[PDB]
RNA sequence: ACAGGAUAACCGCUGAAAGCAUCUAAGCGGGAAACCUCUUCCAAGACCAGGCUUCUCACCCUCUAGGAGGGAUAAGGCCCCC
RNA sequence: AUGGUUUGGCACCUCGAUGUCGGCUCGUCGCAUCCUGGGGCUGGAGCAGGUCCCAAGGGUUGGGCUGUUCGCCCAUUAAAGCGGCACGCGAGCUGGGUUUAGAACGUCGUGAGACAGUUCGGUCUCUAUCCGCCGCGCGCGUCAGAAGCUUGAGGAAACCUGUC
RNA sequence: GGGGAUAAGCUCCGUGCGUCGAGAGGGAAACAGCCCAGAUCGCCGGCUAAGGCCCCUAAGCGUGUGCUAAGUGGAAAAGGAU
C-alpha cells in the first residue's frame, strides 16, 4: 500500500526492458532478471520511474503489489551499487583467509572448512578476523552469509562464532 | 519450543503469528518461543 | 469405540433423517 | 569401466605371504573368453557385452547357435553370459572376436564373483533358516526338529506370505563380494582368489571388478 | 422388438485427446464415456462398441490443490508391511502414463468387459503417437447447454 | 557401503497485507539411521503376455472345395540308455 | 477428552462342546520410543544430563527364587522398551499350576460333607477335503514352429553397534 | 420418566405413536425395526414420493448472486489464536 504505490527512482544508465510482465534490468554490474504474476501490471512511469498497478484491492493484490515494488527497488539499487554484508570472527585462535575465490576458516574443528563461491558473489577479507560478502542478489548474499553464521553452534558464554557486523548477541554466565 | 495447545504473549514483545498452519509466538527471549501442535 | 461412533454418526445422514435402529 | 571375465572353479588350497601369513585361496581358470556379440542403446537399448567360454566338438552345437557364432565369425563355445556395463566408455574397449586374458587384473584388486550355488535338496527349516527346533526331552511328543507355530487364531486366519518353511534351498545364483586377489598366473591362465567362492568344482563362475571398490 | 447389435455391426473410430493442462477428472470422464460407448445410439452394456482413445502430452496434466504433493497413491504387494505409497509428483517424474491410466480405470466397470475395454486405451507421455495411419479424430471436450 | 534426489522436526535468506516487523502469503535454500534410487535375488502367465538374434523358412490326400480335416516332414524336442 | 490393556457394568452369538494360567518354538503389527540417528530450551561452563518435537530401519542378553505373569537380586550391556493379534499360537509341544475321582492338616457343620485355605499324586485323540503358505511339475497361451542372450514394471533379503 | 455415572445395542413403566414380529419393493455403500410406500396376475406403456443427476450409476462437469483455501466437505471436547 504505502510502499506499493510509490514510484521508484531510476538513475542514468539503467536500462529496463518491459517484455510484458517479465522484467529485466541492465546496468554496469550486470543484467538482472525478474518475473511477476499475471494480475499486476508493471507500468513505466514516464518521468523516469516505474510504477506498479493492480486491478482489485483484494487480499492477493494488496499482498503482492507491495512485494513487487520492494523487489524491483532492491534490484535497481543493487545494479547501481550492489550489496556488501560485513562479518566478523570473534574467538580465540580463530581466523579466516582466502584461497583465490574460495574462503577458509579455522573454527576449532579438527579439519578446516571451506566454501564454494556461487555464480554472482565474491568474498573479500580485510583482516584474518574480518571479512565481507559482496554481491548483487540480496537473496544470495544473505543466504551465504547466514550459512556461514550457522557453522559454529552458538555459544553465548564466551562469545565465539561468527557475527554479522552489528550483531549484538545475547549472553549468560556459567560461573563454576 | 514449548509445544502446547495454549500459547500466549507472555511478555510485552511476544508476537503471535501463523506459519504453515501453525500458531507461533516469536520473541527475542527463547524461553518464550512456542507453538501449537 | 470407533465402531459404535461410526454407527451413531452414519445415522446423521440425509436418507435416514436423523435416526436409525440400534443407533 | 567394469572388467569382468568368465572362468571355471577348480578347488581350494593354501599359500603364504611375505609376512608369512596364510591365505585360503580358491583357484579359478579363466580360460581366454571370446566376445560373440555386443549390446548398445541404438540396437537394444542398453550397454553390455556378451562372452563365450569352453569347447564344443562342432556337431554338438545347434544350427541357431552356430549361426549366432558364424555371423559374428567366431567358433562355438559352451557357456555364453553377458556382463552389463554403463555406456560407450565400457564399450569402446571391446571388439567382436577379441581374446580376453586374465592379466586384466592386478594383485590387490577387489572383485565380486557370481556363481550357481550347491544344492541341498528338500530342506527343512533347521537347515534353510536356522531355527531353534524344540527340546529333545522333557515330555516332547514327536516335535524334536519341526518348527512350531505358524500364525494366530481367527485373525488373520491366513499365513502371511514369506512365512518361512521347508523346500528346496540351493541351486540359485549367488554373489560373493569384495574378495581380494592374491596372484595371477599368465602361463596357465589362472587366478588365485582369496576367500571362498560359490559352486561345485567344475562349474561356471563370473568374476568382475567390484562395485564398492571399482 | 428393441434393437440389439449383431456381430457384423460395429463401426470403430480412433479419437485423440490433448492433455494440455486439461483437468484430469474431465479428461478421464470423457475417455470413459467414449470407451464405454455412451455417445453413440447403438449402446448396449453387454457389447463393447466404444472408440479407441489416444492421449498425448500426458506429462502436461496439471491438477488442483496440493494433490501434487499431499495426495498419496497406494499399493500393497500382499506381504506384511508391503504397503508402499507414492505422491503424484514422484509418479509423474517416474512415469506419467500411470496416473492418467489408473484415473480412467477407476471410471470404468471393473468387470470382464472393463478389462476388454482397457485394451482400447493407448496413452503416451509425449505429444506423439505411432497411430497416424488410422487418422485419429481430435476430440475437444465440450459441454452442451440446455 | 560410499555417494545422490525429494523430505519430517528444525535453522534460514529476500518480503508484503499491516509505513517498521514476520522462514510465506508469491518465490529460493540447507536438513535424519525413516522415504526413492544405489547394494544381492526373482521376474514378460508384466494379457500393454516385451526386445535384440539365428536356423528351418516346404510336401500330400480327402470332405466338394465350405472352411476345415487327415497324413509324412525339416529346425528342434521327447521317450528308451550311461 | 483420548486409548480400550486393567478390576468391573449389560448379558447380545456360542452349553446337540468356541479346549482354559504360564513356559517353548515361530512370528508379524502399532508408537504413547530403551539404545543408536537429527534437533529446540535450560537454574546447559566442559564431561554427564533434565524436559520437549520429529523419527519404527535395525537391535532390544544370559542367570538364581517362585508353577507362577508381575517382581526382587547378581554380572554385563550401546540398550537391557511398552502393548495388540481368542490376555497371538495345544488338528504345533509341554502339563508344573488350576478344575474329576484317592489322602491328610486347620476352620465350619451333630452328620453326610464343604472352603476364591493348604498339602503329595493324577491318560492331552485325529491318515489334511477346501482356503492359505513354502517349493516343484504337466498343459495351453503370447497369429508360423523353434534355440540361445536378456531389458525391467513390480516384489522380496539385508540394514545392528562397541572399544582404544 | 425412574434405577445407573443423569454410561451402556443396559434394565423397568406410560403412549387410538410407529414400524419389525407376520411385510416384500425403492433409498440409506452392504444393514429385521430409519425415510417413502402397504405386492390380485400379465405389458419391451406413462406420471410421481423419499432420494439424487462428473464417470462407475439412468438423470444437470444445470441458471443467479455471495462464502470456503481447510481436501473443510468426507467424526469430536475444555480451551488457544491478528
Curated annotation (Swiss-Prot), chain A:
GO terms for biological process: cytoplasmic translation. InterPro entries: Ribosomal_uL6-like (IPR000702), Ribosomal_uL6-like_a/b-dom_sf (IPR036789), Ribosomal_uL6_a/b-dom (IPR020040), Ribosomal_uL6_bac-type (IPR019906), Ribosomal_uL6_CS (IPR002358). One of its GO terms (cellular component) is cytosolic large ribosomal subunit. Keywords: Ribonucleoprotein, Ribosomal protein, RNA-binding, rRNA-binding. One of its GO terms (molecular function) is rRNA binding. Gene3D superfamilies: Ribosomal protein L6, alpha-beta domain. It comes from the Bacteria. Part of the 50S ribosomal subunit. This protein binds to the 23S rRNA, and is important in its secondary structure. It is located near the subunit interface in the base of the L7/L12 stalk, and near the tRNA binding site of the peptidyltransferase center. Belongs to the universal ribosomal protein uL6 family. HAMAP family: Ribosomal_uL6_B. This is Large ribosomal subunit protein uL6. It comes from Mycolicibacterium smegmatis (strain ATCC 700084 / mc(2)155) (Mycobacterium smegmatis).
Curated annotation (Swiss-Prot), chain B:
The keyword Ribosomal protein applies. GO terms for biological process: translation. Pfam families: Ribosomal_L36 (PF00444). InterPro entries: Ribosomal_bL36, Ribosomal_bL36_sp. PROSITE patterns: RIBOSOMAL_L36. Keywords: Ribonucleoprotein, Ribosomal protein. It comes from the Bacteria. One of its GO terms (molecular function) is structural constituent of ribosome. One of its GO terms (cellular component) is cytoplasm. PANTHER family: 50S RIBOSOMAL PROTEIN L36, CHLOROPLASTIC (PTHR42888), LARGE RIBOSOMAL SUBUNIT PROTEIN BL36C (PTHR42888:SF1). Belongs to the bacterial ribosomal protein bL36 family. This is Large ribosomal subunit protein bL36. The gene is rpmJ.
From Swiss-Prot, chain D:
The lineage of its organism: Bacteria, Bacillati, Actinomycetota, Actinomycetes, Mycobacteriales. Keywords: Ribonucleoprotein, Ribosomal protein, RNA-binding, rRNA-binding. GO terms for cellular component: cytosolic large ribosomal subunit. PANTHER family: 50S RIBOSOMAL PROTEIN L3 (PTHR11229), LARGE RIBOSOMAL SUBUNIT PROTEIN UL3C (PTHR11229:SF16). GO terms for molecular function: rRNA binding; structural constituent of ribosome. This is Large ribosomal subunit protein uL3. Belongs to the universal ribosomal protein uL3 family. Pfam families: Ribosomal_L3. The gene is rplC. One of the primary rRNA binding proteins, it binds directly near the 3'-end of the 23S rRNA, where it nucleates assembly of the 50S subunit. It comes from the Bacteria. GO terms for biological process: translation. It comes from Mycolicibacterium smegmatis (strain ATCC 700084 / mc(2)155). Part of the 50S ribosomal subunit. Forms a cluster with proteins L14 and L19. NCBIfam families: L3_bact. Gene3D superfamilies: 3.30.160.810, Translation factors. InterPro entries: Ribosomal_uL3 (IPR000597), Ribosomal_uL3_bac/org-type (IPR019927), Ribosomal_uL3_CS (IPR019926), Transl_B-barrel_sf (IPR009000).
Swiss-Prot record, chain E:
The keyword Ribonucleoprotein applies. Pfam families: Ribosomal_L13. The keyword rRNA-binding does not apply. Disulfide bonds: none annotated. One of its GO terms (cellular component) is cytosolic large ribosomal subunit. Keywords: Ribonucleoprotein, Ribosomal protein. PANTHER family: LARGE RIBOSOMAL SUBUNIT PROTEIN UL13M, RIBOSOMAL PROTEIN L13. Belongs to the universal ribosomal protein uL13 family. This protein is one of the early assembly proteins of the 50S ribosomal subunit, although it is not seen to bind rRNA by itself. It is important during the early stages of 50S assembly. This is Large ribosomal subunit protein uL13. It comes from Mycolicibacterium smegmatis (strain ATCC 700084 / mc(2)155). The lineage of its organism: Bacteria, Bacillati, Actinomycetota, Actinomycetes, Mycobacteriales. The gene is rplM.
